[PDB]
RNA sequence: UGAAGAGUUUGAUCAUGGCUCAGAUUGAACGCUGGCGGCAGGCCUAACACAUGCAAGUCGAACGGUAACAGGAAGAAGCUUGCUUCUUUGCUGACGAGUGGCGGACGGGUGAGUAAUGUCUGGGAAACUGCCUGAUGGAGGGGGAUAACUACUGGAAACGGUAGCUAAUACCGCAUAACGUCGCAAGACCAAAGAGGGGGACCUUCGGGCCUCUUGCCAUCGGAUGUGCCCAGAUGGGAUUAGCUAGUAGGUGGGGUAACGGCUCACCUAGGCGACGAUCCCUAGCUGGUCUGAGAGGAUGACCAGCCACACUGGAACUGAGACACGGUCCAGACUCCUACGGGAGGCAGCAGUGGGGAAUAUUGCACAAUGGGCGCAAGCCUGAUGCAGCCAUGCCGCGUGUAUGAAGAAGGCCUUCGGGUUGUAAAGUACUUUCAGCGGGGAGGAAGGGAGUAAAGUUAAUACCUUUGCUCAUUGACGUUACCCGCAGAAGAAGCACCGGCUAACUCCGUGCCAGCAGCCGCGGUAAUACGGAGGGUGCAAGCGUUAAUCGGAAUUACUGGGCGUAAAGCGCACGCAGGCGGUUUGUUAAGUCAGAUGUGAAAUCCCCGGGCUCAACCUGGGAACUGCAUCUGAUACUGGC
């Protein structure tokens, strides 16, 4: 009949067209930092790092990745730019 | 510390671990005679200097690997 | 259950008058009482001790009218707090409401008293009680209700009791048909100080 | 979710009604944290009605538990 | 601290030895019989499938709309012609669905799977919390669809596909950035909504503004129960079951979560488990407890309290504080009902009913009145939960089936020192009295909040609205022939079943003649059979009696307590070596064994022991014991262990 499954069958796709859209968007802004370590310059990579944090903060301040995953992604990429010459 | 024991090494085939044998020291619950009863622990050791047949001192901790909830403290006696 | 049928057979097996059909038919017997239970006993006598132990098991409970399950249930309260079971059991059987109403004189037998207790006529501590499985408290009141005081059977029960001796462990005012139960009796004051070696081993195994 | 409540005890014909501090998880009268007294509907020869421990209820009300209305006025008439 | 022993090999007699029994426990079973009140118990089998009906709904004090009732308005002026009808309209109290929200993960059912890193006890470190109930702040304004409804296209229809309308405390941005987070840093990031009532001064389409009471939104830190994760120590049986393990055991680089971890991907190693029993098979859910017995040690984990796992079967996903999700989704399998031929939809190991599988296991019960839980600011709604009746000897408990009168024994029978005896005072007929049931008249308590009043400097703007603990009044009941009280009739509605040579209480007449039969054991049965048949009499339990089974006992018959091996089972032909078991005579050290004293934990229930109430006990319970332990300190130091 109805219960909660009938609503969840349409509203979970409306969520997959908003929340999972931003999951994939954030993962693309992360992938674009692993290109900027091939620009021959440390300041061009630091430019692309502060181009990636503003979407990681949007998922951290909203409370989806705030327990460790935001601090893990920020630290992991901070090490890749502190590794450059 | 919560638990701290001494025992004897039986396997040294590991680069961050050893296997240690310890005694129960127990009265048999119906036949009344005392028994040694040997039980095994897989123990954390990142120095890799203690070896087989040596006597070691070990302490209980939070899990470090599967079946690995103890870590090395001292080498008590050297068996050569 | 309880026993039903011919009554003289009961007084014949108990070797004693039971107040059953015991008017002018009791005078100088001629009724097989103290003589002939059954018809045999003198020609092939077995004299078995299991048979006397079985006879004691009937004898000790039929006087109080209580059945086997009831008797072993009182024995359960006599066998706790060490032995001496015959004296500790006596205090329980003598504390029954059918036994106390019989000792107050309102019945010619414990069964006649038990049948007056069932007929809603008896009250204890100021309220009506219709069970004989009750136990009377010391210095508590037992009384008969007004609509039973003039009954010809009860009149004849108090008329029998006033021709006999008094039990000292209770008192009743015949001008009110009311009074108090003082204490549970003692086996050496109710009869005599003697040992009965069967009753201290009775029931179980 | 902890509350102070008058619990169903002894059910049929002659109930006793104990008063308890308990968590709202699962069952109506399952697990409890502290049992603090009894309402007891029987006054027959006894002064053992409406009893409550005034140290234990004060250790929960407004400091970890809520109070049920069927106890919220009982606390002012304890064995009165 | 509690205390069952006996029978049978033989000419036997003492030993030894198999077999068998009296008892207690049970949700038990067959059969005969079965009266009245109470407490408990009533598919441990196929984890087999289910007709009919019902089980988790709720909110108009967010609101697009209007199923319903009575009103307000507007029409037809109705026939149903003297009433207040018919038809519309959300105006209003309201509310059949729709949007939206809270909760659906609990309350019930069950033992198939599982010898388990499952579960219990006792600890531990890396881990959770929507709601409930506090605490500090915010409390501005927009943008974008759609169900209901109306049509198009197919169907008889549940309902698929497709165009159109439209509301929000729903949905998503911007500003703000808190009691949140980050970089040396300009900074970079996450919100939100009102709503119902009332009123002083003034304005007013006197609804609106403004103020204020009640109650909502958003963020962050608490309060406190409980959930995840891991480690000792234990769990049914087994070795004429010996091997089993490539994510198994270990390393080295990268990832995932609220956290642990071979949780997970890759590159390398040969480890790990196993005789203190791995592999594998049958059996079995775990604990509190229950419970046999002298006790040990097992057995047993239906009921009540707490865990595990299952939801016809397998495997996933969506959502949330919480799900490998009873009665949800979704795919596939096995089985079934409906068809107008489009195909569609299911699963009672819930509550009541029904068929299989069996030795064998409730009504197709009354109501939501109260109480719990869900929703509701609240009156209320929901409930096979729960109250509260029935059916069934299955156990236990209270209580029955009445009294008087009646013969040197009527009539019959049974046995005849043939004299008498005896069933039996029993019967006939004659008179008395009723517990329990049947049937009447009276009749509680579970009832309070709620409706009205009164009061409270109630929160305010003190006694408007509203609202609350008491008080004054009218009231709310399924059960019900109830609890309890008094009567109306009549012995009326009521007694079985083995047992009687000996163990084992009851006696020994005739018939049969090793047959017919009996039987637990010993043994009985060929011309008086104390044992069969047939008897009359006699004993014992009793709404039970006989006949069995499960699990124990007797059983020391697996031996700790507590054995057997010269010859009554078995000393292995002898010496060598050996994991394990035992170890001189002393001092010093340690406190693992042991022992002492503290702090905890062994939930509630329960045996035992002491008090109280139900008419007694059971039951409902106030208290003390106990769960001999397992942890965290402190302490003795004799002896075993260790140094």
CATH number belonging to domain C94-180: 3.10.290.10
Round to whole Å and give the CA distance between B23 and B6: 9
**Contacts for C101 with CB less than 8 Å, ≥ 6 apart:** C107, C113, C114, C116, C117, C122, C142
Could you identify the residue written with the tokens 């120095």?
A: B47
User: What token pair was written down for B7?
Assistant: 């025992």
- CA neighbor of B44 nearest in space, from B28, B61, B29, B30: B61
Spatial distance between the Cα atoms of C93 and D54, rounded to a whole number of angstroms: 47
Residues 136-195 (C) near nucleic chain E, CB < 7 A: 147, 151
CA C8/CA C31 separation, integer angstroms = 8
CB C74 within 8 A of CB C89: yes
Q: Is the CB of A69 under 7 A from strand E?
A: yes
Helix (H, G, I), strand (E, B) or coil at B23: strand
Q: At what angle do helices A53-60 and A69-82 cross, to 10 degrees?
A: 160
If we measure between CA atoms, which residue out of D10, D26, D55 comes closest to residue D18?
D10
Secondary structure class of A1 (helix, strand, coil): coil
Burial of D16 (0-12, 13-18, 19+ CB in 10 A): middle
Q: What is the resolution of this structure in A?
A: 12.0
- Asked if C126 CB < 7 A from strand E, the reply is no
Which residues does C29 contact at the CB level (< 8 Å), separation at least 6? Answer: C35
Q: Which residues contact A77 (CB under 8 A, 6 or more apart)?
A: A30, A33, A49, A52
DSSP state of D8: -
Distance, in Å, from the CA atom of A37 to the CA atom of A47, rounded to the nearest integer, reads 11
- Alpha-carbon Rg of chain B, whole angstroms? 14
CB burial of residue C37 (10 Å; 0-12, 13-18, 19+): middle
Structural fold of domain C7-93+190-204: Ribosomal Protein S4 Delta 41; Chain A, domain 1 (1.10.1050)
Residue C89, classed as helix, strand or coil, is helix
Residue ranges of alpha helices (H) inside chain B are: none
Helix (H, G, I), strand (E, B) or coil at B40: strand
Strand E contact nucleotides, protein CB < 7 Å:
4, 23-24, 35, 39-40, 98, 100, 103-104, 106-108, 117, 123-126, 128, 130-133, 172, 180-182, 185-186, 188-190, 220, 223-226, 229-235, 249-252, 255-263, 271-274, 276, 296-297, 305-307, 318-319, 323, 325, 328-330, 371-374, 386-388, 396-406, 421-426, 434-436, 469-470, 485-487, 495, 502-508, 537-543, 560-561, 580-582, 592-594, 604, 608-610, 612-616, 619-622, 632
CA B62 to chain centre: 16
Structure obtained using: cryo-EM
Proximity of residue A24 CB to strand E below 7 A: no
Please state the domain extents for chain C. 7-93+190-204, 94-180
Helix (H, G, I), strand (E, B) or coil at B57: strand
Best CA proximity match to B60, nearest among B73, B47, B48, B49 = B73
């Amino acid at each position: 009949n109805i219960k909660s499954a009938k609503k969840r069958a349409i509203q979970s796709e409306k969520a997959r067209k908003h929340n999972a859209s931003r999951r994939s968007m954030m993962r693309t802004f992360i992938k674009k930092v692993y290109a900027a370590i091939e620009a021959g310059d440390k300041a061009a990579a630091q430019k692309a790092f502060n181009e990636m944090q503003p979407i990681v903060d949007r998922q951290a301040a909203k409370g989806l990745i705030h327990k460790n995953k935001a601090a893990r992604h920020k630290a992991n990429l901070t090490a890749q730019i502190n590794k450059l010459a | 510390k919560i638990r701290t024991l001494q025992g004897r090494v039986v396997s040294d085939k590991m680069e961050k671990s050893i296997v240690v044998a310890i005694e129960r020291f127990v009265k048999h619950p119906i036949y009344g005679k005392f028994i040694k009863r040997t039980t095994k622990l897989h123990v954390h050791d990142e120095n890799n200097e203690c070896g087989i047949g040596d006597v070691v001192e070990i302490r209980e901790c939070r899990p470090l690997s599967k079946t690995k909830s103890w870590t090395l403290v001292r080498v008590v006696e050297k068996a050569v | 259950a309880r026993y039903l049928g011919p009554k003289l057979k009961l007084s014949r097996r108990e070797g004693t008058d039971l107040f059953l059909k015991s008017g002018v038919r009791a005078i100088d017997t001629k009724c097989k009482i103290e003589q002939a239970p059954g018809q045999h006993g003198a020609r092939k006598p077995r004299l078995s001790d299991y048979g006397v132990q079985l006879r004691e098991k009937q004898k000790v409970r039929r006087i109080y009218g209580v059945l086997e399950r009831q008797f072993r249930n009182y024995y359960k309260e006599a066998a706790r707090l060490k032995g001496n079971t015959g004296e500790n059991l006596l205090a329980l059987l003598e504390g029954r409401l059918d036994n106390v109403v019989y000792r107050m004189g309102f019945g010619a037998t414990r069964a006649e008293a038990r049948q007056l207790v069932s007929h809603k006529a008896i009250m204890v501590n100021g309220r009506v009680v219709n069970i004989a499985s009750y136990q009377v408290s010391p210095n508590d009141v037992v009384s008969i209700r007004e609509k039973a005081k003039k009954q010809s059977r009860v009149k004849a029960a108090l008329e029998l009791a006033e021709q006999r001796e008094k039990p000292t462990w209770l008192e009743v005012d015949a001008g009110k048909m009311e009074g108090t139960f003082k204490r549970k009796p003692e086996r050496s004051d109710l009869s005599a100080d003697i040992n009965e070696h069967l009753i201290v081993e009775l029931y179980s195994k | 979710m902890v509350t102070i409540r008058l619990a169903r005890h002894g059910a049929k014909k002659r109930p006793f009604y104990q008063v308890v501090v308990a968590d709202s998880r699962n069952a109506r009268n399952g697990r409890f944290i502290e049992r603090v007294g009894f309402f007891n509907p029987i006054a027959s020869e006894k002064e053992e009605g409406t009893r409550l421990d005034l140290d234990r209820i004060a250790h929960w009300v407004g400091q970890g538990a809520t109070i049920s209305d069927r106890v919220a006025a009982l606390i002012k008439e304890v064995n009165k």
